[PDB]
Enzyme design. Structure first.
Site, PDB file in Angstrom:
ATOM      1  N   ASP A 155       0.843  -1.187   0.000  1.00 50.13           N
ATOM      2  CA  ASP A 155       0.000   0.000   0.000  1.00 50.13           C
ATOM      3  C   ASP A 155       0.879   1.238   0.000  1.00 50.13           C
ATOM      4  O   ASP A 155       1.807   1.345   0.807  1.00 50.13           O
ATOM      5  CB  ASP A 155      -0.924   0.025   1.220  1.00 50.13           C
ATOM      6  CG  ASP A 155      -1.855   1.221   1.223  1.00 50.13           C
ATOM      7  OD1 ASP A 155      -1.885   1.970   0.224  1.00 50.13           O
ATOM      8  OD2 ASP A 155      -2.547   1.426   2.238  1.00 50.13           O
ATOM      9  N   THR A 184      -4.372   2.093  -4.592  1.00 43.39           N
ATOM     10  CA  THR A 184      -3.191   1.804  -5.389  1.00 43.39           C
ATOM     11  C   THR A 184      -3.447   2.058  -6.867  1.00 43.39           C
ATOM     12  O   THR A 184      -2.598   2.624  -7.563  1.00 43.39           O
ATOM     13  CB  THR A 184      -2.769   0.356  -5.161  1.00 43.39           C
ATOM     14  OG1 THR A 184      -3.816  -0.518  -5.601  1.00 43.39           O
ATOM     15  CG2 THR A 184      -2.523   0.112  -3.679  1.00 43.39           C
TER      16      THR A 184
END
Lengths: 513, 534, 510
Positions: free
Chosen positions: A50, A84
């Site tokens: 992440d 993302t």
């Protein structure tokens, strides 16, 4: 004060942050998964798939890096995942076109290109979006475990998806908002410490962990009746104001005692009236709830209107001033079950509440307290698939050719849609092909020529449904690959991403203060 | 403050600080030139440290912009003047002055006497105002050929919501005329926000529908209480019903709960009696301010009553004067036994409630106290309506602003591209310093269209060619007719055919910033005896 | 290297980065140096001589580069110019443009041979549809307007303004006078600038134009036995004596007297060797000249090696210093040898014109040579742009219209072909817009406007750009249909020659 800034200098610093944002996660994203490490000023490692983590944890680069965590949380809220994706898509789409087009120098013809690719996204998506049935929890389960396997977890994909399937259906707004768009407030996620997936009970309703805190309270009563104040609690919250003496030790105490004694008698007014639950939204006092627990009356105290409101409809409890005072009832049953289920000695009361607005706080169980969080995340984005597939049974096969599925159709429309806009359209035609090719570059081989063969395979054979495998880099059927990509996710990540790019295209000047 | 500095307080001592001020001032004025128009690129501008404002509105930014110069003071000042003045020209007033403060003071010391210098701007700031007010040639909501519809269409046509200028052309015509609010001092103008403008993600982009009377907004999904009776009449109430607390405001500090609990038992019955007593005077639909609580939303629906509650008071107020009801006549206290009369009856032909698009309202049909109208928008999504609504709002306010000014002058610098020449001509033959000055005026009028279209990527030479290709020696006259098209579409950045559109500004917002911007050139001048305090 | 070792100035950065940029900057110069342009590039010689040209080799010859990258390729434009006229200013920029796409492919990480061949592959594909781009051919090499239509182009390809009457006067120079059947002569066609009058006043005198003064009486006969001599009279006297004037005094009066009849001897022996004109690379000798006026031998007081060259060249002449009674070796060629005044200067004229020995010598009037030079630059090309030595040149669109034609074509194929080969073949058909971008600048517009329309005009073999307002907004000229055309030939060469190096120049990392 008095300040002015210029263009590409402000435009490149976007990419300068936006690129780096887009970089390591595209190796982290997908089946190929990497750790984005942070070196703390403290010297510690922080290793993530992440970006927002390492982003938030560190110095904020003002123009781009501040923008995306927002649109990340914008995206993180939307389907529950794809922060993302957005952050990499935007910076991607922000890179090659801009300077090229900004050496050709124009904001606007670039802007219209963001939509067309986003539109060329939409159609061929929903064209090649494969309807997968919600009538089958299976045809949800096939795609729901698919999006719980996104990076590191094939494990909780089994359990957390099971919990998410009918929950999403059971998830309701309180407008009868359906429930395909359903939020994680009405899906609510509270992981319950300890236990195990064998201990796991399927709670498609809400847990009120306030409900039974002690066995004295009502337990295993089919549906409660929540008496809210107004009579069963008469009104004195106050105290008789006895004298105080700094000399004596007892006079400090006896004044605070007289404050709780009235709710003590309000909770006493409750005992005789005999609710099974009293919701006290103003709340009760310490010694008072002992009196409550005398009559087997569980106290839901200092709780908001809506928690009760949802729970009332959820738990099937009426809303009354007093059992001998009648406006009649709210609901006698919204809940086909009342489960008081404990790990440790704190009773977590899990009440499965059929298609109720409720919280749908869904019981999830890890092998311990800690991995519950991932199960929850595995349960969150499992609901994502459900709510996606409940929204659109159409979704797209995946493994990344979805990202190509737009990219080459763009190439054709660059030659079709044309104008001078083709050049932005062609310059944004390129952005979508780096990400799968990166999965295939994580594979290596020729990630380039394969993608050209994919780009062939795009128009030759299939844009996405027959795709490329991300951890492999061969021509595969993204349906036969079994990696399913939610249609709405495409509607989200791309859209959200193009806009921050339009955003950071729009602002060529940033004054500080 | 430049060079080796023996003095503080913005002393570069003369032309230096003058230049440094024109360095200072213009360094502010540049944010607008790109920010000019909505197509003018926004700027993400930190307000404090992490507080970023995104604004292409200059004087809005110039309020964020802080004043470190006498140049910085006045431009923020004068643009914020023009800002609070209108809001049209906030951006615009900022651009040309930076040149106008780059020009006249150079002549002001070339004074035979300092006064004649700025008057080269001033009587030109008039000569334009003349020419400006002379412009009906574009920006006409004063008349179209179908009058306001085509003008509202030309507005909507100059915009895109999607398919527009169809019901929306008409819709603009309603909105003002739908407003009987008579703006003070005999102004034949109708506030466009006084319209009840309602929206549906259902039906079609182009689609919109006017409603007889002001459409009352009745809360949807929240009423287990009946709002629906078909009758001629309504009772608009300023009033509410609460069973939890109505007679009870008092503290719990009272030693005995006895008083609070027993009136609490009396509070519920009269709320059942109150509805019937607003029913029994001839109002079955009874429009009540309502606003009942959450757990109180339980108490009415379970026990039962009929009142229309939680309605928009803005509508309920508009519907009140619309139908002829009275929100307050005998209503003062809060109670269910409170007296009620027929003076609260609203008068409509019928009072109907139509659900459509999955949206229902209380329709007061042909309100008898005042003509009332509400247009309900139809989108493909809730998105489409904000487009139509504001594209309408382009005409709407302009229509009202054309009701504010008959003289309505072309939006876009094509008004100036004329003025940047005619007064540039009006420079030479003037002679001497205002010859010098009036050109400085006019030649600087060129910069708004360049920047604006650069902001829209329609740029300069083309625009400024096209603008002044229209204007000729053969075409010197504002007229109304275009072999000289003096109009410029702002959003396009390129001059277009919209002569009627609500994207163009009337002469109101125009003649001012001329006076404003030149003042900035004036304002900085004012020093006598440059000094320093210690 | 890391070591002390070997020899390289390319490789690593240089190969990828710096050579491409060495392959860049000068192409960057040539971009508006080619095609219709108002670009102008000043140059000083080794003479320090201020001059302006959009021709490369002139600029090129004086450019030194540590890399071969810029260095080696320029021979191709010469190898080109060896073949034809301009298109040479196009040759390199074609390479440089298409080149730097590869360093991008190097950023994209494409292998050399992978980068190499797709061009070469499509280099055929160019040459393959290149005949499909023949929109006309050359009908009458005798016709002026047949030829002037072309000649305007290389001149245009040089410079925009003067092209027309040039293209006229050059066919009015009668490129006609040769079959150009495989027989064509730019030794028999020479551009000889009179400094004087105008360049619109510039003429073409068929027959050798020598602005050099026609010295004394004109030729003995017009089939001139020609004595071309580097130094035919250096003086016959040596004065060295007691004083190198007089010591025994009468010994002086011998040689200054005895010198001149030796100049007579030589001049009589010019009449005796038989030269109908004697030619002095060295000085004229006045008595000799007077004798050559007696003998009526045409003379040239002074002769450039350039003179002597063409003299020695075409006459069959041999320029020699002679302190002796001369010997005809040089003999004759030209069957009419005249005096002209063009710009009103004595013009030594030699004309045998046979249609084969045919001499049409362009005689440029003008008040500036730099003028008549940058002129002669384009004039250099037009004649040898005219010189294809195909009477039928398969006229293809001038000005670069054929570019966009195959931009669509070969990248559409470049589309069709697979692999990393694609962008190789794809970048190929992208190499066109460079000049449509380059001249679009001097035209005054962006190339997207140009190219989108140059694309949106699609297959034309007409619609194109240059220095024009037609080149500005429309992205449309007639670079065919207006009379601006190109031989099929140099196309093949301007295409091929640059493609080779661009391939090749990268492959060498040394």
């Amino acid at each position: 004060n008095t300040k002015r800034e210029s263009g590409r200098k402000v435009q490149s610093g976007n990419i300068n942050a936006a690129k780096t944002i887009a970089d390591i996660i595209r190796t982290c994203l997908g089946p190929k998964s990497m750790m984005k490490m942070l070196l703390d000023p403290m010297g510690g490692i922080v290793m993530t798939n992440d970006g927002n983590a390492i982003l938030r944890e560190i110095q904020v680069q003002h123009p781009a890096a501040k923008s995306m965590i927002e649109i990340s949380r914008t995206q993180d809220e939307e389907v529950g995942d794809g922060t993302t994706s957005v952050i990499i898509l935007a910076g991607e789409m922000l890179s090659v076109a801009e300077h090229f087009l900004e050496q050709q120098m124009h904001p606007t013809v670039v802007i219209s290109a963001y939509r067309k690719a986003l539109d060329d996204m939409i159609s061929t998506l929903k064209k090649i979006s494969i309807p997968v049935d919600i009538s089958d929890s299976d045809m949800m389960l096939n795609i729901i475990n698919s999006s719980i396997t996104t990076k590191a977890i094939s494990r909780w994909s089994s359990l957390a998806c099971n919990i998410a399937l009918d929950a999403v259906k059971m998830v309701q707004f309180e407008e009868n908002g359906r429930k395909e768009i359903d939020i994680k407030k009405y899906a609510r996620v509270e992981k319950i410490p300890g236990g195990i997936i064998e201990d796991s009970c399927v709670l498609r309703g809400v847990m009120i962990n306030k409900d039974v805190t002690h066995p004295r309270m009502r337990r295993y009563i089919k549906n409660p009746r929540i008496v809210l104040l107004d009579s069963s609690l008469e009104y004195k919250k106050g105290e008789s104001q006895t004298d105080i003496e700094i000399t004596r030790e007892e006079d400090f105490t006896r004044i605070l005692q007289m404050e709780e004694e009235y709710i003590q008698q309000l909770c006493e007014d409750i005992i005789q009236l005999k609710p099974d639950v009293v919701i006290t939204e103003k709340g009760i006092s310490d010694l008072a709830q002992h009196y409550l627990m005398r009559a087997n009356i569980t106290a839901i105290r200092r709780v908001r209107k809506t928690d009760n409101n949802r729970i009332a409809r959820a738990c099937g409890a009426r809303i009354v001033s007093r059992p001998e005072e009648l406006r009649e009832d709210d609901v006698g049953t919204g809940a086909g079950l009342l489960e008081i289920k404990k790990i440790g000695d704190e009773y977590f009361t899990f009440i499965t509440d059929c298609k109720d607005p409720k919280a749908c706080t869904i019981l999830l169980r890890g092998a311990s307290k800690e991995i519950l969080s991932e199960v929850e995340r595995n349960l969150q984005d499992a609901m994502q698939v459900c709510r996606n597939v409940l929204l659109d049974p159409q979704l797209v096969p995946g493994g990344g050719a979805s990202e190509m599925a737009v990219a080459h159709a763009l190439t054709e429309k660059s030659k079709a849609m044309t104008g001078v806009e083709q050049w932005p359209y062609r310059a944004v035609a390129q952005a979508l092909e780096v990400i799968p090719r990166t999965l295939i570059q994580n594979c290596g081989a020729s990630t380039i020529r394969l993608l050209t063969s994919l780009r062939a395979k795009h128009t030759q054979e299939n844009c996405e449904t027959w795709g490329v495998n991300g951890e492999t880099g061969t021509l595969v059927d993204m349906k036969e690959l079994g990696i399913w990509e939610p249609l709405a996710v495409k509607l989200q990540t791309y859209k959200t991403a193009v806009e921050t790019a339009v955003l950071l295209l729009r602002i060529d000047d940033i004054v500080s203060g | 403050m430049e060079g080796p500095l023996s003095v503080f307080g913005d002393r570069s001592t003369g032309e230096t600080i003058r230049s440094q001020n024109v360095m200072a001032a213009a360094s502010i004025a540049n944010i607008v030139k790109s920010s000019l128009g909505p197509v003018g690129l926004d700027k993400m501008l930190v307000d404090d440290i992490g507080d970023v404002t995104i604004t292409n509105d200059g004087a809005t930014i110039l309020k964020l912009l802080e004043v470190e110069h006498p140049a910085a003071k006045v431009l923020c000042e004068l643009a914020d003047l023009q800002d609070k003045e209108v809001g049209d020209g906030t951006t615009s007033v900022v651009i040309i002055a930076a040149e106008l403060l780059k020009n006249a003071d150079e002549l002001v010391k070339q004074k035979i006497h300092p006064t004649s210098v700025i008057s080269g701007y001033r009587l030109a700031c008039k000569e334009a105002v003349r020419y400006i007010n002379e412009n009906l040639i574009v920006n006409t909501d004063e008349l179209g050929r179908d009058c306001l519809i085509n003008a509202a269409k030309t507005s909507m046509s100059s915009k895109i919501i999607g398919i527009n200028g169809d019901f929306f052309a008409n819709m603009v015509v309603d909105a003002v005329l739908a407003i009987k609010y008579t703006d003070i001092r005999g102004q034949p103008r109708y506030p466009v926000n006084s319209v009840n403008i309602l929206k549906a993600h259902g039906r079609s982009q182009m689609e919109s529908m006017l409603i007889s009377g002001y459409a009352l907004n009745c809360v949807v999904g929240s009423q287990g209480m009946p709002k629906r009776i078909v009758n001629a009449k309504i009772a608009c109430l300023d009033f509410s019903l609460q069973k939890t607390k109505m007679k009870l405001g008092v503290q719990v500090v009272i030693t005995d709960p006895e008083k609070l609990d027993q009136i609490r038992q009396r509070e519920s019955d009269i709320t059942k009696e109150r509805i019937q007593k607003i029913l029994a005077t001839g109002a079955n639909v009874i429009l009540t301010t309502g606003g009942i609580d959450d757990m109180c939303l339980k108490y009415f629906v379970e026990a039962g009553a009929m009142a229309v509650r939680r309605v928009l008071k803005r509508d309920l107020k508009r519907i009140a004067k619309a139908s002829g009801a009275t929100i307050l006549s005998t209503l003062a206290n809060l109670e269910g036994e409170e007296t009620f009369e027929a003076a609260m009856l609203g008068q409509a032909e019928e009072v109907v409630q139509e659900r459509i698009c999955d949206d229902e309202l209380i329709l007061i049909k042909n309100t008898k106290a005042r003509t009332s109208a509400s247009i309900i928008l139809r989108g493909a999504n809730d998105f489409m309506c904000d487009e139509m609504e504001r594209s309408l709002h382009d005409a709407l306010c302009v229509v009202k602003r054309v009701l504010e000014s008959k003289s309505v002058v072309p939006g876009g610098g094509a008004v100036e591209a004329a003025l940047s020449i005619y007064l540039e001509n009006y420079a030479t033959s003037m002679g001497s310093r205002e010859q010098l000055a009036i050109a400085e005026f006019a030649r600087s009028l060129l910069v708004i269209p360049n920047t604006l279209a650069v902001n829209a990527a329609q740029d300069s030479t083309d625009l400024v060619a096209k603008l002044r290709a229209f204007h000729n020696e053969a075409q010197v006259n504002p007229e109304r007719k275009n072999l000289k098209w003096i109009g410029l579409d702002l959003s396009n950045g390129k001059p277009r055919d919209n002569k009627q559109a609500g994207v163009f500004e009337p002469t109101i917002v125009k003649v001012k910033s001329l006076k404003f911007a030149t003042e900035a050139a004036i304002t900085i001048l004012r020093i006598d005896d440059l000094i320093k305090l210690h | 290297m890391l070591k002390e070792g070997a020899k390289h100035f390319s490789g690593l950065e240089e190969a990828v980065y710096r050579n491409i940029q060495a392959c860049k900057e000068l192409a960057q110069t040539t971009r508006t140096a080619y095609g219709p342009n108002g670009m102008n590039k000043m140059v000083i010689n080794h003479l320090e001589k201020l001059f302006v040209t959009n021709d490369a080799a002139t600029i090129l010859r004086e450019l030194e580069v540590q890399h071969p990258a810029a260095k080696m390729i320029v021979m191709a434009s010469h190898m080109q110019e060896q073949e034809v006229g301009d298109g040479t200013n196009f040759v390199l920029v074609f390479a440089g443009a298409l080149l730097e796409l590869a360093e991008e492919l190097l950023r994209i990480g494409l292998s050399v041979s992978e980068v190499i061949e797709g061009y070469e592959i499509a280099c055929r594909k160019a040459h393959e549809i290149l005949p499909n781009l023949v929109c006309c051919s050359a009908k009458n090499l005798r016709d002026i307007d047949e030829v002037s239509s072309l000649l305007r182009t290389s001149i245009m390809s040089k410079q925009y303004g003067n092209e027309v009457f040039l293209a006229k006067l050059i066919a009015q120079a009668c490129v006609s006078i040769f079959p150009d059947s495989g027989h064509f002569n730019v030794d028999n066609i020479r551009v000889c600038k009179i400094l004087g009058s105008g360049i619109s006043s510039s003429s073409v005198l068929h027959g050798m134009v020598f602005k050099k003064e026609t010295e004394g009486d004109v030729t003995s006969v017009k089939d001139a036995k020609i004595a071309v001599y580097s130094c035919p009279f250096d003086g016959m006297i040596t004065e060295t004596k007691g004083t190198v004037l007089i010591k025994t005094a009468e010994e002086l009066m011998n040689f200054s007297k005895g010198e001149e009849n030796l100049m007579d001897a030589q001049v009589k022996a010019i009449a005796d060797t038989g030269a109908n004109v004697v030619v002095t690379g060295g000085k004229v000798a006045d008595m000799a000249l007077h004798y050559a006026n007696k003998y009526n031998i045409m003379l040239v007081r002074l002769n450039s090696k350039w003179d002597l060259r063409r003299l020695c060249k075409t006459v069959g002449a041999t320029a020699l210093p002679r302190l002796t009674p001369p010997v005809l070796e040089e003999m004759g060629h030209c069957d009419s040898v005249y005096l002209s005044e063009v710009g009103d200067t004595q013009v030594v004229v030699f004309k045998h014109e046979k249609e084969d020995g045919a001499i049409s010598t362009i005689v440029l009037r003008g008040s500036t040579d730099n003028l008549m030079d940058d002129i002669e630059r384009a004039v250099d090309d037009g004649v040898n742009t005219f010189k294809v030595l195909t009477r039928d040149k398969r006229l293809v669109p001038g000005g670069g219209a054929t570019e966009i034609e195959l931009a669509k074509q070969i990248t559409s194929y470049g589309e069709t072909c697979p692999g990393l080969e694609q962008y190789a073949i794809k970048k190929f058909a992208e190499a066109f817009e460079a000049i449509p971008r380059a001249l679009a600048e001097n035209s005054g517009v962006k190339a997207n406007e140009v190219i989108s329309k140059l694309y949106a005009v699609h297959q034309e073999g007409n619609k194109n750009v240059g220095l024009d307002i037609e080149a500005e907004v429309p992205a449309v000229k007639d670079m065919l249909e207006a009379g601006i055309l190109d031989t099929y030939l140099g196309k093949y060469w301007a295409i091929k020659l640059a493609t080779n190096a661009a391939v090749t120049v990268l492959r060498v990392d040394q």
